[PDB]
Design a protein around this ligand. Structure first.
Ligand code: NA
Lengths: 512, 512, 128
C-alpha cells in the first residue's frame, strides 16, 4: 500500500551523489567557483529537492517546466506539480551566469549545500505568476513575497548534493523521505495517513486524526511544517513542544511524529495538491486535507483568498492520478452532554448543546489569562502555549514620548520609571535611549519579547519605523495618532504619569 | 514624652524659608549664580538637612565642626554628632568659590534645591577621616566611597531652602519630621519606638517589634531607609512592598510606616548614634538598636568591621545625653513545639528543639525556588521577594564565546540558539553582538535582568569589563579562568553545545 | 456508587474471535495480549481458552466483573450463550452480527489489532 514516489523514483540526491561528496565539496570550496548564498525560503526548498521530498524534481525549475506549472499545474512532461520551485536571483548575479555554468549554493555564507549546473536564466512575468498561481490578490502572502523578497530572475538548473541544510534542533526528528519510509517498514506500517499543520494541535485535531486512522485502517503520521509557515505565527519550537506532548494522547503505537522542513506559500488550493505530493514522497498512502487547507485567510476587504473547500476538491479531483487517498476534515463542534466532537452536519443545534472556541477567543484567553476548557485542548498543551504567549501581566511594552511633548523628557522618564517600580510583580523596567541608532532600535522588540517595560524619551526617524515593530509599542503624544493622547503638551508630569499608568492598567499590563 | 529635636529646635528650613521661596527660586535659576549638581548621596543628605531630620545642622559642616565630629564625635559647640555630613566637590569647582560665595544646588541639573552661602572650603585628610570615623579598614563601604567617589574638597556653608528633592514614588509616604510629629499628635501618640532597616522584614521582625512596643508602652514606627543602603541590595521598591504588607500583620492602630531618605554610611558604631539622633528629630522617644546595627559585615580575611554589640553599647552610652531610650534587639531563634521566637539566652538548646533560617539559606531557597516556612516569613512577603528575586529557571544569563575558540562563531551561536529554543520555559533568547560598544555592553545586564538568555559571539575589551557586570555571565573558553572550560579550541560544535547545555542545567537555568 | 459501578476505564471486557476468522487464532491472541499490555493502567489481561467447558464459560463474567480483559480464541456453542452473559462481551467477526466487523476474514493481524484497539478506545475502555 505504501505509495511509490511522485514520478516513480525517490530523487534522494544525497544518496545518489554520496561517492562524489568530497569531490563536490572541494569544487564548492574552491575560489574559482561563483557563490550564491541561499535565502531562507530557498534553504527549505533545496532541502526537499536533495531530500527527494520534491520528487521528481532534481533542481530548480527551468523556464519550460515553470511555465507549464504556472499555466497547467504540471511539469513539461505532464507530471502534476502546482507550486513553482524556482531559484530567484538578482540582476547582478544573473549577469555572471550562462548555460552550463557551475554554481555553488551555500548556507549562512559558509556551509556547502550543493552544486548547481545552470541551463536557464529568465526574467519571469510576476504578474502572470501571481495571477495564475496565487489567484492575483495583492495581499496574498505568496504574491507579496513574490514581488518584495523574491529576486526578479529565475535560474533553472540541475543539482548535485553535498549535504542537507544544517539544523541543530530536533535531530533525528527531521526524518528524510528515505528514513521515514524505512521507519514505516521497521514498524510494518502499510497504510499511513498524514496530517498537515502549521499550528498547535488541540483535542479536536487528536480526535479527527484518530478517527481518520480508524476509518482508513492506517497509522498516523503527524507531519508538522517547521521550515516556514505563515508570517507572524507561533514559533515552530513551541509547536513542536505541543506536538511532542499531544503525540502521547494517542493509543500506543498508532502515531509517529516527524518534522517537514517545508516552506509554505499559503497557496491553499495548489498548495494542498503540493502537500499531497510531498507526503506521498514521504511514504503516505493517505493525506488529510482540511477546510481552507493552507489558506492565508481574509484580505483587507474581508474577502477570502480561497473557498473553504477549494483545497479538498482540487486534491480529490487529482487523487486517482496522484495515487493517494484523500481524507477530508469536516467542520466539527463539541457536544457537552456527551463529551465528544461531531460533524456540524449531523447536529441540530435546536435540540443539542454545542461548544466551540474560535482562534480569536483562544488568542483572547491567552492575552487576558483566562481559563481554557479541558475539552477544547489538553492541559499540558495549554501550559505550553501559556509560556510562549504570556498574558498581558507578563508582557513587555514600550512607551514612547511624543515629539509634541514640551515637558522635561528626562524628568518624565524618571517619574514613569519610579512609578512603574512601585507596582512590581517581576517586570524589569528601563529608560531606553536609542539616539536613532539602528543597533539599539533593533533591540526594542527584544526587550518587549523579554517582558520588559521600556520608557523611551524620544521618537525615532520615520525611515526606521520598519526597524522596530509596532507590537506593544505605545505613543504618548497630543497628535490624534497617539495611543495615549494628552490634551496639552505642557501638562504636569503627575498628570501625564497617571494617564499612562491607567492606560497600561486598562490594557492589562498592570494588575492590582 | 515625645523628645524635642536634637539641639532643642527642629531645623525645618523648608518651613523657615517659605516666605522667601519665589525670591530664592529666582536667584537659583539666575544666570550669574554658580550652579552645582548634587550627587545622589548629597541629595539624601541635603534632604535631611532641609528636612530638619539632621537637626541641629543648618548646612554642610565646615572645617570647624567637621574635625570636631571626626575626633570627638561632637560638633564644635559640643553637641553630639558622629557622622560627618559634608559637601564633597572636585578641585576645579573649589577654585571658583571663596567665602561668602553663594551657590545654587540643583537636582538632576534642572531642579532648584537650595542656595548655599559658603563659609569654608578645605581639603580634608581622608586618611584620618577613614581612620577615626570608619575604623580604617579599606574594604569598608564608607572608606571606599570616601576615596573613590567623594570629592576631595569639602565646602562648608549655610543653606536656604527652596524645595526638598523630587520623588515620584511613594508620595506622602516620605513624611518629614514636622509631618510625622503631626501625624503622631493626631493619633494621640506619645511614646514611639522607631525601627530601622535596610532589609526585608520577616515574622521575627514583626514579633520583636511588637514585643518592644508592649514593653515600652509605645506605638511602633517602621522607619525604613529608601535612599542608599549597602552596595548591591534589594531595591527600596521591593522592600516598601514588603513593609506595606507586613505592616498589616500588626494589631490595628499599633504601627505606622514612613520612609526615610537616608544615605547610610554603613558605619555601624557611629551610624547607630546618628540614627538615634535622626529618629529623635522625627519624634521617636525610643529607638531600636540591633546586633551589628548598620554593619557592613566582614572584609576579605573574614574579619568583622564591627563587633556584634558595638552599636548597642555606643548608643546605650549616650542615651541619657540624647534623651531617648534604647531598645536592644537580642538574637532570637524559633521554637517549633511552641510556635514562637525566643532569645537564645533562655533556650536549653539541649532539651529544646529550635529552628532558624540564615540570610544565606534564604538566599539559597530563593535561587533554587525551594519552600520557605510560614513561621519564618509571611506568605505575602515571600511572594513579593520571589517575584523580585526569581529562581534560576526564571533567571537570565549570558554565554560569552571565548577568544581561544577557533570554531565558527556564527555557527556556534546559531546552534546554541536553536538548541536553547527547544527547551522553552518562557525565557527569551538572543544572539547579542556588542562590537565592543558601551551603548550595547550596558544593556547586557538589563537583558539578564529581564530573564533573557544572551549568546555573545565575542569577548569585549578588558578596558570595558567595568561596563558590563559579572552576575550570571559565563565564559566558554579553554583558559582556566573560563566558567565552562573546553579541552581544545576546535571541538565539534555539537560537543560544545552539550557542554554548555549541561552546565546551565546543573546551574538551575534549565529544568526538565 | 462509583466503586460498585466503575467507569469504562476500570471495566472488564471480552473479545471473542469470530468463527469466520481465518487468521492464526494463537497469533492474533498473542498480538492482542501484547498490545493491550502497552496501555496498562491496572487492568489484568488474559488469553482465556474455555474449550466449550461450562466450568470455564461460567467464569467469563466473573473476570469481567473483576475488570479483566479477556481475549477469547474461539466462540462457544450456541446452546451455551446462556451460560455466559452479554455484558461487555464483544464479537470480532465478518458477520453483520459482530460488534467489531472485519471487511475480510484474512486481514493482517496488525490490521485486526488496530481495529480492536480503536473499538475499545472509542467505547471508553482505554484512555490516553
Ligand atoms: Na526568504
Amino acid at each position: 500500500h505504501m505509495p511509490a514516489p511522485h514520478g516513480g523514483i525517490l530523487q534522494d540526491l544525497i544518496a545518489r551523489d554520496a561517492l562524489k561528496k568530497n569531490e563536490l565539496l572541494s569544487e564548492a570550496q574552491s575560489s574559482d567557483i561563483l557563490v550564491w548564498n541561499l535565502t531562507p525560503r530557498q534553504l527549505c526548498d533545496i532541502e526537499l529537492i536533495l531530500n527527494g521530498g520534491f520528487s521528481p524534481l532534481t533542481g530548480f525549475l527551468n523556464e519550460n517546466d515553470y511555465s507549464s506549472v504556472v499555466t497547467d499545474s504540471r511539469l513539461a512532461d505532464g507530471t502534476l506539480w502546482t507550486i513553482p520551485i524556482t531559484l530567484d536571483v538578482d540582476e547582478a548575479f544573473a549577469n555572471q551566469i550562462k548555460p552550463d555554468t557551475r554554481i555553488a549554493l551555500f548556507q549562512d555564507d559558509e556551509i556547502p549545500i550543493a552544486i548547481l549546473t545552470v541551463q536557464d536564466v529568465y526574467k519571469p512575468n510576476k504578474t502572470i505568476e501571481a495571477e495564475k498561481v496565487f489567484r492575483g490578490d495583492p495581499e496574498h502572502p505568496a504574491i507579496s513575497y513574490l514581488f518584495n523578497v523574491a529576486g526578479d530572475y529565475y535560474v533553472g538548473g540541475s543539482l548535485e548534493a553535498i549535504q542537507l541544510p544544517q539544523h541543530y534542533d530536533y535531530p533525528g526528528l527531521r526524518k528524510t523521505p528515505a528514513q521515514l519510509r524505512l521507519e514505516f517498514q521497521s514498524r510494518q506500517w502499510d497504510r499511513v495517513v498524514a496530517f498537515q499543520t502549521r499550528n498547535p494541535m488541540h483535542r479536536a485535531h487528536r480526535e479527527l486524526t484518530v478517527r481518520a486512522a480508524r476509518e482508513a485502517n492506517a497509522k498516523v503520521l503527524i507531519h508538522p511544517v517547521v521550515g516556514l509557515t505563515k508570517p507572524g505565527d507561533i514559533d515552530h519550537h513551541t509547536r513542536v513542544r505541543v506536538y511532542q506532548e499531544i503525540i502521547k494522547r494517542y493509543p500506543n503505537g498508532i502515531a509517529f511524529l516527524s518534522l517537514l522542513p517545508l516552506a509554505m506559500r499559503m497557496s491553499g488550493d495548489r498548495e494542498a495538491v503540493w502537500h499531497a505530493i510531498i507526503r506521498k514522497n514521504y511514504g503516505a498512502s493517505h493525506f488529510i486535507v482540511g477546510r481552507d487547507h493552507a489558506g492565508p485567510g481574509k484580505n483587507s476587504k474581508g474577502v477570502d483568498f480561497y473557498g473553504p473547500y477549494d483545497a479538498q476538491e482540487l486534491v480529490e479531483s487529482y487523487k486517482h492520478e496522484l495515487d493517494i487517498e484523500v481524507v477530508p476534515f469536516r467542520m466539527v463542534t463539541y457536544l457537552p452532554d456527551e463529551d465528544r466532537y461531531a460533524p456540524i452536519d449531523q447536529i441540530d443545534t435546536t435540540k443539542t448543546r454545542t461548544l466551540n472556541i474560535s482562534g480569536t477567543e483562544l488568542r483572547r484567553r491567552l492575552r487576558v489569562g483566562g481559563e481554557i476548557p479541558e475539552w477544547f485542548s489538553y492541559p499540558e498543551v495549554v501550559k505550553i502555549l501559556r509560556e510562549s504567549n504570556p498574558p498581558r501581566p507578563k508582557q513587555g511594552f514600550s512607551i514612547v514620548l511624543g515629539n509634541s511633548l514640551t515637558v522635561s523628557r528626562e524628568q518624565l522618564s524618571i517619574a514613569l520609571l519610579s512609578t512603574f517600580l512601585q507596582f512590581g510583580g517581576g517586570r524589569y523596567y528601563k529608560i531606553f535611549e536609542h539616539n536613532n541608532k539602528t543597533e539599539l532600535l533593533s533591540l526594542i522588540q527584544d526587550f518587549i519579547g523579554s517582558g520588559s517595560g521600556l520608557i523611551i524619551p524620544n521618537q525615532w526617524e520615520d525611515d526606521k519605523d520598519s526597524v522596530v515593530g509596532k507590537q506593544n509599542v505605545y505613543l504618548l503624544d497630543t497628535s490624534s495618532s497617539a495611543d495615549i493622547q494628552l490634551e496639552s503638551a505642557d501638562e504636569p508630569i503627575s498628570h501625564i504619569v497617571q494617564k499612562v499608568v491607567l492606560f497600561l492598567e486598562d490594557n492589562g499590563f498592570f494588575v492590582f
